[model samples]
Every structure is written in C-alpha cells, then in structure tokens.
Target chain A: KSKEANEKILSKETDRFTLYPILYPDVWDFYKKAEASFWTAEEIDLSSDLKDFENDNEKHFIKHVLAFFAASDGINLASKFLRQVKITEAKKFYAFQIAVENIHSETYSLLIDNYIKDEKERMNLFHAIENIPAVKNKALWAAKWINDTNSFAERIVANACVEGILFSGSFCAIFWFKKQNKLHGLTFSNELISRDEGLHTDFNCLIYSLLENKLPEEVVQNIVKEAVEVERSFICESLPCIGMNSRLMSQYIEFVADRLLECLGSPKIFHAKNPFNWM
Target chain B: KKFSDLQKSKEANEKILSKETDRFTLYPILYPDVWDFYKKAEASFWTAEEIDLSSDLKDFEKLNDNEKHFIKHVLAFFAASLASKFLRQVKITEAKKFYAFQIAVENIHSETYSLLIDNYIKDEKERMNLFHAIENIPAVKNKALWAAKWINDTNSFAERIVANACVEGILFSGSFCAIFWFKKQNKLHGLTFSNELISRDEGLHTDFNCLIYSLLENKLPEEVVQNIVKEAVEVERSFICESLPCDLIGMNSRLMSQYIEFVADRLLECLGSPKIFHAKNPFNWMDL
Candidate 1:
C-alpha cells in the first residue's frame, strides 16, 4: 500500500488510488409554466434549444458541465460519509478538489463563449437550464456542505462519486471525440482531468482505510454501505437530461454508468455488464 | 548583504512579477467610425434659414391653402410612416442598443407630430386635402415599398440597417432640413418644442445607424459590407427620387438638396467611401 502510494512514474509522483476532484439572474418563467400546466394538466416542454449541438464534443462539453454539478451534489451529501475517518492533510485535499471544480467552471464558460453567440439566446438558454432559483441554491448548498462538515469522509466520497464520476465519464467521451478526429482539446483536458481524478480516488480510498484502521469492522461496513447508497443516489440524480436528445439516451447513460463503475472500482451492485457493451 | 537584505530584494521582484499582463486586458467591442458625424456633409449644404413667427394676429391670414396642404401633408406622412414599421427589418445587431433606442425615439417623435397636427391644424377640408396630397406622393409609395421588402423578407438584420440608413438617415434628414427652412421663413406654425424634440431625436437616430454601419461592415466579410452599402444606396436613391421629391408639393429644391447631401455625406462615410459627387452647397446639390 505504501509502495503504491509512493510510486513515481515517468516524471510524476504517484499517489495511492487515483482520485480526482472536480450566476445572477432575473426571471419568473416558473409563474408562467406552473400556471399554464395546471390549466391544462399538460407536461411542460422544458427542453432548451441550446441542447442542439453539431456533434460529440458539444455533447461532451454539455456532459462535462452536468458532471461538475454531480460532483457538487456529492459534496452536498458528504456529511453522512465522514463519520469515522481522519484525513492527514485535510486542507490540501480540500484545496485540490476546489481547484478542480474551478477548472470545470472555466471549461463550461469557454464553451458558452465560443459557441452561444446571440446574447439573448444565450441568456434564455441559461434560464432554461437551471430555472433561476435552482442555480442560486446549487452554489449556496455546495458551499454549505464544504464548510459544515466535521469528518472529511463524506466530502471525500461526495467528491469521489460526483466529481470523480463526471471526470471519468468525460474521459470516456474523450475517446469518442478522438475516434472522430474532432475536438482534440477534449482529449487533452480530460487526460489532465483523469490524472487529477486518480489522486482524488485515492483520497476517498484513504478516508475509507482510516475508518477501517480506526473504527470497528461493523461500523466501517455500515458507513461504506451508507456511502455507496448515497453515492448512487447523488450520481444518478446529478445526471442531467444531457443534450435533451432522445437518440443519445442509451449511449450517454451507458457511458455514464460504465465510467461511474470504473471510477468506484468494482463495487458490489455497480457490477452489471453494460447493455451497450463497452468492448 | 545579509539574508534579510536578500529576502527584501526577492520580495521586490515578486511584486513586479504580480502585475497583470497584456492578455488580461479587456477591449472595446465596437468600431470607432460608428460614433463620429460627418463635418464635410454639414459644410456646403444650403440649410434653411429659421422662420421667425410674428406674435401679432396679422400673419394668420397670409398663409395660403396650398402651403398649408404641403406642410400638413409632410408632417402627417412623417408621423404615419417614419415612426411606424421602420426598424423592424434592419440587421443592425452590431449596434443593437443604439438601433433599438433610435427606433423608440422616432416612435415618440412621430406621436408628437401627430398630436400637433390633430390639435393645432383646425381646417378640416385643408386637413383632408393635405392627407390626400401626402397619399399621392411617390415618397409615400416608396416608403411602403422599402418597408415591405425589409419587414417581410429574410433580411431581418439587414432590415434593421434599412431603418437606420434609408428612413431615419435619409427621410429624417430631409424633413429636418425642410423644418429648418420653414422655421427660417417665418412660416413654422407648430409649437417650437415639437420641432426641437423631433430634431434631437432624428440626430440620435442618424448617429445610431451610422455607428451600426461603420462597425460590422468593416470587420465582417467585405462582400457583406458591400452588399449592405449597395442596398442602402439603392434604397436611398429610390426613396428620394420616387417618394419625397420636392416637385411633388413644389417645396424649395435647395432645401431638398441640402437634406439629400446631408444624408449622402453621412452614408458615403458609413460605406467607407469618398465624396465623389460635384454637387456643391448641400441645399443646391440635387437637380435645380
């Protein structure tokens, strides 16, 4: 375990079990939508026009954004996972995770800047994606989870599950972009993202080990089991209707689950061979 | 030097390194030509002398029926056409705020003119005659023509520029020259404030279109620039000769010329071209 933690490959220092860590608005669209829906009992056509992308990179860009939000969701549920874990360099780990999240923000912004040209259209799309209040609460909630936690295990698992899952899914999508000879930046960015995710995966594992070393087996098992459940819930809930396209349904979800399993490392029921096989 | 002295030197170096680089600076999003007015266009135009009104009642009987028909027709046509359905078709996204604001101002100016005509011009037969005369003018016909092409077509953004260049830039410029002429001749009949309001608003509209034309055409594809300018020039010509000719109502040719020159000079500048015409004195630049 020490050797794996300390191993230096190529020109880099190796860490144990790779782990990665990953607006203003004014409007009252809800007043109209909710009112209209009640009058007719009709399903609101909540899909946005910005979801239309030319190809996979645009799709991946959207996925990357959704995944960042998922990592954020994980952090929100971090409190219950950290019951018996002790982190040696807690601040540095937290800082690394925060920095990763910042990078993810930049990636999304760059995509929006380069792609969404019309200011009104872009603003409309932004409102449609989040519906104003949800966007505000998502940011405020993430900050609360980060500050209020006592043990770092919950945050670590949250980071691992949400950010880790997203980074992994993004990396998997990078292979698709690479195969098509489109969007090489997705490949380069996701490669670095993968390296970061490796470190984060280790941080989650380390938190797990500390619980094992310090707490009773039954207690550790209960926490892990609880974490896995919360992790699944956060991960699945965080999966946005990415791209809002019906055709991408099987591919995108399968891609998401396959990557989630890969990041979580052979966990018990995350074990199903994907319906659209990866091989 | 001691270690503390060395540390101070290092700290000074660190402070210098922390300053922002050129890449971090923000830049202006618009072209410079959009903001400037054409001084050359203003010089050598025969502007109408301000018409002084006598406070006494003796002047009211001297105003003839023909002149009344002409003046009322001009103002009525302006209120109906200039304020309505003008900016809906221009592709002036580059100067969106300016374009939108200018259109709003025109709408306000049009309403003011309409109110003045409704309240102050009391002769019903004269009023109906003036309306009939305005309806017959080719300028009236061409206004509809241009509006139809712009508002009804695929050239939505181009339509924005048409509002800016043709209607606001040309028609408004001509009307202002006529207004100044009327003011100079002591024949200006409306409240002084109404003309002043419309003049100021027209100035802003011209500036807005000029800015828009100057901005995107220079940076965008040359073909796009040329196409927009070419269409504008064609529209300007058709609207002037066909729609608002002075001969239609027997107004002074020099005032008409001044208006056309004012519009042309600004427009040519907007197209990034030189003044190629030999028409001197913007008031006499058109056919005598």
Candidate 2:
C-alpha cells in the first residue's frame, strides 16, 4: 500500500498495486484501448473452417500456424511483462495482455477442435509445434526470448519481433487465404487475433520507445534481423504450396522488420515493401 | 525449454507451486481440475462498460452524507486492486492460466470501481482524492496492507496458498457484504450487480486456491489456516463497521460479524475443515 505509483516503468515496487494518478498515461491509455477490443472465441462461427480444412491438406501453412498457435508462448511472453513491470498502469496493461493472450490461445484451440475431429489428428496438430522442424524452429525463435529472463529490454524487444514479424508472416499466409475467401471463419478469427497482436506489437514497441528515450539500438536491429530470417526460412519452406513468390515472401518479412525497427525509434534496416495489396 | 520435462523418465508428477518441468505446454494438461478452473473463470469475461452506472448517478443524489460515505470508501477499497505478479511465482501452468483470468477480472473490477467513483463523486479533486485514498486513507489501507501481506509471504508455497485462500475467501466477504447491504435495501443496483460479478470470481479464486492447497503434499497445520482466518476476521470487522455509517436498519456489526464468520466457516468447509463459528447466514439472497 505505497502512497505513490512507481516512478519508473521498471521500478522495484510493482508489489504496490495502485493505478491512481496513473504514473504512465501512455501505458494506461493502451490498456483501455485493449479493453475496448475484447471478444470471445465462442462469438465467432468456425464452421466454414471445418469445410475449408478438408480442402486444404496440401497447404501445410494451416497446420504449421495451427500447431504454434495451439501451444503458443503468447501467454508466457505476455506474462513476462506482468512479472517485470512495476507501475500498476503498466502492470494493468500486461495483466490484460495475459487475458487477451489466453483468449487468443483459446481461439486456436477452438479452431483445432473445429478443423480436426479425430483425436489422433488433433493431438498431432497440438504437438506438431515441437514435432515439425520449421514449425519447431519458429517455436524456438520465440522460446529464445522466453528464456531471456534477465533483460526486460531484451525480452520486450524480442517480443516486438515476435508479434510484429514472427507471427506476421504466418498472418501473411492467412491474409492470402483471406483474400481467396477460403477458410472464412478461420480467416475472420485470424483477423480478430491480428487486431490484438498489432496492439501487442505496438505496445511492446511503445514501452521500448518510452524507456529508450529516458534511459536507452543495434540490439533491436539484430533481433529483428534474426526474426526476419527465421520467418523467411519458414515462408521459404512453404513456398510452392500456395505458389507464394519467394521475393514477395522475403520482402514481406523485411518490410515488417523495418516497421518494427522504426517503431523502436531505429532506422529501417530493410526497405522492402509490403508485397500484399490487401496489406 | 523444459526439454528435460519432455523426458519425464524420472517422475511424471507435477505441482502447483514447484516443478522441474516448465508448465508451458497445455498438452497432457497434467491437472485437469486446474484447467477446468481456468476455463470456468475465463468464461465469465466482462467489462465495466457492460455494467451501466447511469442509475447510480441519480441514486447518489438521493443518499445522505453517511450513506454516500459508505459507498465512496468501498469503491476506494476495490480500486486499490490486486497485483498479478504472483502469476509468475505460481508453479502450475494451469493455475497460472486460471490466475491470468483472475487478475484480468481484477482489472475489470478496478474499472467498475473507478466507474462507481466517477458516478458517485463529481469533483475531480474528490475523485482524485478517493482514488489516492486507496493508498493513503487509513481505514481501507489497513485492509489493503493486510491483504498484500499474505501475498508477499516467503513461507512455503502451501502456506501462501492457504493464506491466499483466506485473503480472497474469508477476508473479502465482509466488504462484499457491506456493499450488498446497499443492494438489500434496493439501492445502487449497478454497484451491487458489478460487486456480484466480482464476488462470483472471488469465489472461484478462493475455491481454486483451497483446492490447490488440498493437493499439496506438505499441508500447513490446521491452526495455521485458522489463525490467518481469525486475524482476517478481526481486521475486516472494523472495516465493515466503518462502512455501515447509516446503521438505521438491519445492518450492524453483530450481523456483519455473523455473515463474515459464516463466510469464513463456508471457506473452511471448502478446505474440509470444521466450522469454528456456527452462525448461519440470515441473508439468503447473498447465496446468489
């Protein structure tokens, strides 16, 4: 019951939970913004994905995305902010992130339940995150940050790379499917999740932006570059299935990486353009 | 990576407070009951915006200063909020998931309390005053400090779980009864509705912690649980007394004590302990 909110974003008194005179309006405003974007997985109709799943066995992207989504570190990644942040305002945002991330994970589980009725196939999709090489590699890219328990800057920056670039590539494939009007419910659900992830990426970047101003660049670039390469490899592995052009895939990751670095107040490392017209 | 967890060649047992395996994967969700708690808690998702405080605005205009004082202090107590940092220390992943929803609801509760303050108090100075009062106000801060003490405990995980169960279940019931007193007299329906929702989740949190405590191999002594409950009952007694400024009706310290102990016994019974005080609840509506 401290009389004041934590003075800094990373203050040691996170144990004091009071959101009054919010020490950080930027963080509090972001929390309110996330509150407005709330929705349930049950609200969406995934029956369309049921029919779409059967027609889409050739596209491993669906399973690849589903696998990681089913066993997402999104909750753990978001929980890091909950564990580290000191101010109640910032703490509130991270707390809500867990709630939002939990719902996002539930959405993927709902999608799994809908798309795969067979217990064996469903169990396979759940484990495929660690089972498949490229998918497992993608999981490891995020796990690298999950284990970075020392530096808040490092973990959040890495999280920005994850929400901004890592999932953006998988989202790119969903947008591709979305444009084709295939997997309508799944596409819509991804769109909803994309809305939340965009907030997470921007929020992670904003915290970095705020801290770097008062206290704190190439480290961000290095993180983004590695993220871009990992995602590019994943996209490259899925190249022929949907006939996704390697150049376009490569440019998309770089394009997103540049956006992330810019959000971090760093110069754009890769000036690649968004290949998708819908983007 | 919990890669060693991937190989459970030694022992497959998982725990709520300690574990060799990182409870990252929901696959083979070791504790299905913990997972069920997370699901049920998450199912009750709500926002303060869902609750309309419009009538509360008009309702405040009619209340005397004493009645108004009671509402304001309760709002301050709730707005003080809970820290979810404990989610990090929790050893069970499913328990972590359940608490994620729990703290999310706490944020929602804070929002509703803020809204209640906004509707009841008009001045920005008083609004900010009540807001800061959560930290500075003597009466509410006493309860806040007591509640936070159990949370920062370095005692064994089992004791902390019992402490959490007491803090959430036995202790919190009084403040809720104080607010529900307003609803009993048919006033502040919005605040009561919102409090009802909060109480529902607090019930879940209490039961969840108690159930986890029951599963732990090294349980705290019965007296350990009893002392925490007893002290909380004493601490909350004055807070509840201070809340009933207008004791013109059925609400009084004696009745509030009975209801609170009834809640405490109800909480103890959840942990399979015998009731210390056999005061039956007179307010049947509170069972809702």
How does residue B193 of candidate 1 score in lDDT? Answer: 35
**Residue A66, candidate 1: C-alpha displacement in angstroms:** 27
lDDT of 1 by residue, A154-257 (tens): 34444455444433433554545455555545444545555555555555544444332232334333333333333333222434332333224334434444
Model 2: runs farther than 4 Å from truth?
Answer: A1-8, A11-26, A44-48, A55-61, A70-75, A110-155, A212-220, A238-241, B1-32, B52-54, B81-86, B89-93, B118-153, B217-221, B242-250
What tens digits encode model 2's per-residue C-alpha lDDT throughout A120-234? 8766655555554556566667677556543667777887887888767778778888788788878888999999989988988778766633213666677788887778766
Model 2 pairs in collision: none
Q: Which consecutive 10 residues in model 2 chain A have the weakest lDDT in total?
A: A1-10
lDDT of model 2 at position B68: 77
Reference-based lDDT, each prediction: 0.41, 0.71
Look at candidate 1 and tell me the lDDT of residue B197. 53
TM-scores for every predicted model: 0.37, 0.81
- lDDT for position A124 in model 1: 53
Which numbered prediction scores highest in TM-score against the true structure?
Answer: 2
